Amino acid sequence: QDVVLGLYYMTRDCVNAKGEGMVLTGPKEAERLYRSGLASLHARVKVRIT
Amino acid sequence: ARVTVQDAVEKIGNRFDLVLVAARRARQMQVGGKDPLVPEENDKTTVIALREIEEGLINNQILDVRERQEQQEQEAAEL
Amino acid sequence: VTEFLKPRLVDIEQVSSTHAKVTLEPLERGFGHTLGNALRRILLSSMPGCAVTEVEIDGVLHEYSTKEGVQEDILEILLNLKGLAVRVQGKDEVILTLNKSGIGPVTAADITHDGDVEIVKPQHVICHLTDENASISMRIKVQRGRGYVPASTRRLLVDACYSPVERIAYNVEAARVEQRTDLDKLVIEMETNGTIDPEEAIRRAATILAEQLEAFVDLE
Amino acid sequence: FLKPRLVDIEQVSSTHAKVTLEPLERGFGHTLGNALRRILLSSMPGCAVTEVEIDGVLHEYSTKEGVQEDILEILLNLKGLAVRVQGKDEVILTLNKSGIGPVTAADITHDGDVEIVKPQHVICHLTDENASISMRIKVQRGRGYVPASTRIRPIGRLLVDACYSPVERIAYNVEAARVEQRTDLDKLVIEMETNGTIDPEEAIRRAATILAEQLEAF
Amino acid sequence: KPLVGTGMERAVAVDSGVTAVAKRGGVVQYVDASRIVIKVNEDEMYPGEAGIDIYNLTKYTRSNQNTCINQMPCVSLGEPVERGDVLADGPSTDLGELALGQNMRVAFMPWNGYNFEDSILVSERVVQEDRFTTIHIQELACVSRDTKLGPEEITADIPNVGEAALSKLDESGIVYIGAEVTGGDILVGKVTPKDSSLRVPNGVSGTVIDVQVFTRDGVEKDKRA
Amino acid sequence: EIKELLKLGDLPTSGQIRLYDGRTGEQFERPVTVGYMYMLKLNHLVDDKM
Amino acid sequence: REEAVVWDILDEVIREHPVLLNRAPTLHRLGIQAFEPVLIEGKAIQLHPLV
Known about the structure:
The structure is cut from a larger assembly and holds 2 copies of chain A, 1 copy of chain B, 2 copies of chain C and 2 copies of chain E.
Chain A: H1 3-10, H2 27-35
Chain C: E1 8-11, E2 14-15, E3 19-27, H1 31-45, E4 48-57, H2 74-82, E5 86-87, E6 93-97, E7 100-101, E8 104-107, E9 118-119, E10 125-129, E11 135-136, E12 138-146, E13 148-149, E14 156-157, E15 160-161, E16 165-175, E17 183-192, H3 198-212
Antiparallel strand pairs in C: 1-3, 2-3, 3-17, 4-12, 4-14, 5-9, 6-12, 7-11, 8-10, 13-15, 16-17
Helix pairs in contact in C: 1-3
Chain E: H1 9-15, E1 20-21, E2 26-31, E3 35-40, E4 53-56, E5 61-62, E6 68-69, E7 72-73, E8 80-81, E9 86-89, E10 102-108, H2 124-128, H3 163-166, E11 180-181, E12 186-188, E13 198-199, E14 206-207
Antiparallel strand pairs in E: 1-9, 2-3, 2-8, 3-4, 5-6, 7-9, 11-14, 12-13
PDB class: transcription, transferase/dna/rna
Keywords: RNA polymerase, cryo-EM structure, elemental pause, Escherichia coli, transcription, TRANSFERASE-DNA-RNA complex, transcriptional regulation, transcriptional pausing
Entry title: Cryo-EM structure of his-elemental paused elongation complex with an unfolded TL (1)
């Protein structure tokens, strides 16, 4: 009821964003871009994950 | 530090014999003069006993053998 | 009434290098968040460094295309070049060349020396080649900047990550002096891309923040 | 990197004012603004009433024949008193008043090194032709909020909760600055609202001094 | 007062009797913190023994729930009033209008799990302003009974106690009105012939606001009494 | 009528303003409902129950 | 008298000594669980959200 609302809001997609065409190089770059305000939490990026 | 006792339950596969073995070792460390068989991190006697069970160098058989050996040595030194 | 609890670095506990974790306590009540967020905002997006800004490959002029004999796609070559941590001397921007051929992985040890331009990870893989006749070559322009500059804000463009800090994340918890009820204990966990040490990047960010507060400091 | 300087201080009202810091690099306006806002709201030094001794009053749950307010309401009004003692860090004001009417803060016989910044501040109303209050108001300097139930004596001295924090509201904005040939330079407007017992310039200087002294750990 | 009311507050706060409500209209002649005097209009005074109306407000005292019911005037000196309008507000009324709580600036948002299930995250300014600070009054009793070996008296001569123990009591053997006592302090001194002095229970603080003595016939008095 | 009275002030008709985080200085990425509610202190104190 | 030296003795006694936390209608056995204590300022027993 609050942990699940947080994880639902975080893991959702809106078809537009501050950065939607960018291709990231890992989860750490995703956090670095979100915290800097350069991308939205609901972007549609391509992340290289292991 | 201790949070989860799962490895100790793996070593002593009952979780009810684990309590008794750890209690016996903790009472040895506390009432008796026995020193821990593992470098403590300012943990209490119960956590040290549980860690020693996790590291593998204690169980019911080992505790029984050690107690019997020390009783035999005390008897021999009694004359 | 002007004396606050001045913190000290309790420990600089480091996982394998460039993954340090510094704790300072006891901060005054509420100062954990001010210091943590100020350092986080400085480290994340306002910090000098050098990174690959752009790259031109001879055999391809479009981002969504392919070169024969190269295992990765150009979209992945740009990703591999983004993580290329490089430190440059007094020159603001330099250009390097990646001429190579033959079946095998292309690593950062295969770039031209360019004198004082130093690559921190010679084992960093840029591309894989699949044919002995397949030769790859590219000019990578690395420029000095501050923070993160995405390519959309700005001949293939690469999102330039000038700042060395890959991930900075603080976490304030509770600490106490002998009678103080509830204080702060700042726990900063910083990773860098190898071109700088985290226990040095913290001091760099602190110097940057402190030099901002010089025109209106009391020197007391 | 450039550096910010206090380029303008628009004292619009007696209490609330605006200071301006310019130029500021991009991404530094928010950092400096929020750090200064938190430090101002949390750690500013001020003066507050701490102990009160009314003449014929034993406890705060009683009343005095002549005044229109309980002793508790008088203590609350004294808790809301703005005073700017200058040289000391503990002083005792003496209020003496007689006759029908309000008892404002101007009725305090304040010393040379004491400044009451809101003389119209009412304390209690005397409603009898022969009724007089003679109280000893102990104003001392401190920091933050220190309630009377945590500090540390006769049956006359009443304790009031002390809120040594001159600033009541802090806001900040960042907007593009006017430089001759340059862009992406911000300007920080800190709109603060004190109660009058502090100077905005020295408030900003104290906040920055505290921030730099905290950063001096590394 | 509630900013969002219902209009039934002014009826509840008046019909419950907590407020000191004017009986005959007139002009306020003297408003104290503990009394109000109404000079009644001659249009409503009786021909014989005209006089005034006096309302003695119920100051800090104890309710059944050990709370404080306390009336304070809502009128000012020299101010006309009519019949049936409030002169003093009782406990938790504002200008003769029911006021059970405080109007506070609320934000509906999750905040780092401090309002997780139903919890409430309250600012420090709310506790700085003392707007939820309440007053709780509790009475403690000490009875002197004529047991065997002679009766028990209220003298202050308490054995096996230090001077700090008896510092709070007067010479009569009862605590001073206004003495900030804490847990374990002695309030009333009663002696067992052979010590059943009334002492503060554990963990309860407070300030002694009123000491009340009753005596039967045949007991002369104490000066305090 | 509530929206009309909000317009009579200078407040948004939706009743939601844009709040800022107090300890990071950045927006909550949504307009949140801020208003004035009448809170009551129920007679279940914690020092009477501990 | 709660001296300043019994608060570190308490912080050492409390180190790895679990305490049981029970809620009054103990319908099933999960209504009694043992937690390691953390000393807090206040009068309320702070209880982890996931339990």
